[PDB]
Amino acid sequence: PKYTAKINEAEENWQARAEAIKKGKKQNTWDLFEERGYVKDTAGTKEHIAELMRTRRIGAYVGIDPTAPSLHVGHLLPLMPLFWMYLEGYKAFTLIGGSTAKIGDPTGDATMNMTKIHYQLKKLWENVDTQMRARGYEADWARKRGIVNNNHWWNKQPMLEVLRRVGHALRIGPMLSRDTVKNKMTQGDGVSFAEFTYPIMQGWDWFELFYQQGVQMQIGGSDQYGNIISGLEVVKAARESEPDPQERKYVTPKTALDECVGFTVPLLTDSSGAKFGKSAGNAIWLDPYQTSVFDFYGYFVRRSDQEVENLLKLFTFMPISEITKTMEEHIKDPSKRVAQHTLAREVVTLVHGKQEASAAEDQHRMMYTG
Amino acid sequence: PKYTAKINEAEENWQARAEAIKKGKKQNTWDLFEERGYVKDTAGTKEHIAELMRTRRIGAYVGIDPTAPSLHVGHLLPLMPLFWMYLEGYKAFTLIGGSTAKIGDPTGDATMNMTKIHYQLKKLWENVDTQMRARGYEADWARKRGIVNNNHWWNKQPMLEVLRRVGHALRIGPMLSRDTVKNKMTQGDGVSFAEFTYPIMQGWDWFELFYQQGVQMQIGGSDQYGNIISGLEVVKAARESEPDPQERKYVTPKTALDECVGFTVPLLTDSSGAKFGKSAGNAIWLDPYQTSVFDFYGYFVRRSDQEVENLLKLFTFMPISEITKTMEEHIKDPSKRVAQHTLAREVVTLVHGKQEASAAEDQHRMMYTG
């Protein structure tokens, strides 16, 4: 009865939204992704992903392996489109790779790390809510966010079941004919069986999130394209191999838009080759105990004129009109770092909050700042 | 106290045996293996395996994947040295690959198959006991036989634990640079992830048998050499990665003779290329409902003069002196098929029992036999 009525109202709301998009009254979140610059590679055509996003209140996820006690600003990039979807009323999850960090992604303390990353994600998600309220988005019952740790299934998930459900459908050649698996096996050491199996586990992760939460979309870091391709194979195998006739009603695809999709975000460097979120020989951590707020703000205020508009698009919830006005002010006199102070203000506001942001800005407008 | 006293007497008996071998009073079972022709390839040096067998009442196993409801005579070959060890007072196991049959060994109904194979192995093991008594071997408390199904661990064994315990130690290159994995991936279809993982599961099987039963030796079919090499890596990884300090006392090797070893049996064909145990386009099944006893006996009575001594050595418990006397009678007039009737009599006696054997011999000595 009553969850059902609410689900029905949600779908009806979603469908009026869908029609509004078809008529051009409302921008498709997919086209927002393209406009702001989040799309590098897609697993699924852009027409596919657009239409899935228009017609269905999907779930989406980003996975993070807790390889250290703090996230850094480089982690923010895949999270940003995820947060945009959340603001738009999708279901959005950050998956902590508690079990999968121990294998480690080859593309190219641990419990305490897992605890700290959960804490930090919860803190950031709360700042997203704050920003959602500040940017004028209305409450929506069907809007959902969550934090999931893949140890929830990996602690007991039988190997046999994974091999039976997906292992016969996945051929090792495509896994092997992929640049990471050819790279570190030619130049660099070898690939461990555990390393080789990592993409299969991440694919099973996606299956579990599809099954449990309706997650049809994975958003990946810039180097996650191969893992996403493999993950789709794993999820497809798993949905097709479901033995129970009753579960198949729910899990086996019937229609084209039932399929899963994904995309990756761009690789961000400056014109000197530096990786975004690295300032010298260290990360810009989200933890103030590791990187002071002043220094976090500093990182952003030092961004280049050449990259700053692109970074305002990626790392803020500023409407494009707002960014355009900022850039119009900024080019009057770039030496004033209007755009960079805006970027710093917005990103600090998201990670550390408005008060910390104001204080840091005041400090960076002193006559000496380092 | 009392299992302990019995274990101590067993070890003392084993050590008098060991000294008797060192002094040449008693043949090392390893040298029996060599004399009778069971040794093709060894994982571990022959000096290693010999000394392990002299000094330690090891456990050994043969794995069989239940891919059909009956075993056939080709299955007997790896079982024979295993049965010899049993007669000599080792611990000897036949492992049914209940879970691993579903993946299937790539080297180159299902529940009912598992039930029938268990039944047949139990029946054969009982005939081994009969033969043990008939060949003059004395009761030994420490002599042990068993039938184990790897579904005992595979039904619930977590993938994560397997990957953490062995997955980092096993490199995919050696797995990949092996002829089977290069064969069916070049010529022939692909290799499924499940296929590629099969040797890891069989290696974990061996670990479970080492842990549970003290099994240090695997005997393999003629094509199982690669699987045995991989299995040793898996068992070594697993014994070295045991996290508990108390378990390490028992599971982590301390000495050279603590290591696991294995060997394979020869590939048996006749001079026309036919696979041993194939008579035309069908197997010679151990099940009388599939291959009559008459026809089973017939298969053996038709063996060639060129191969019959070799087959008496492999497929019977006849002392070498007995086989020599048989061959001395046989060469007086080969047309009488003395040696072949002896081979038929002995193998039928093992699989179907002495009464069935006598009847089949009488039938094959009629003036018309097909």
Ligand SMILES: N[C@@H](Cc1ccc(O)cc1)C(=O)O
């Ligand atoms: N493999 C990703 C993280 C990840 C982990 C688990 C997942 O299910 C998804 C993504 C990385 O290292 O960047």
Ligand SMILES: N[C@@H](Cc1ccc(O)cc1)C(=O)O
């Ligand atoms: N792989 C072997 C059978 C086997 C199965 C499991 C084991 O643990 C050992 C051996 C075969 O097909 O001949």
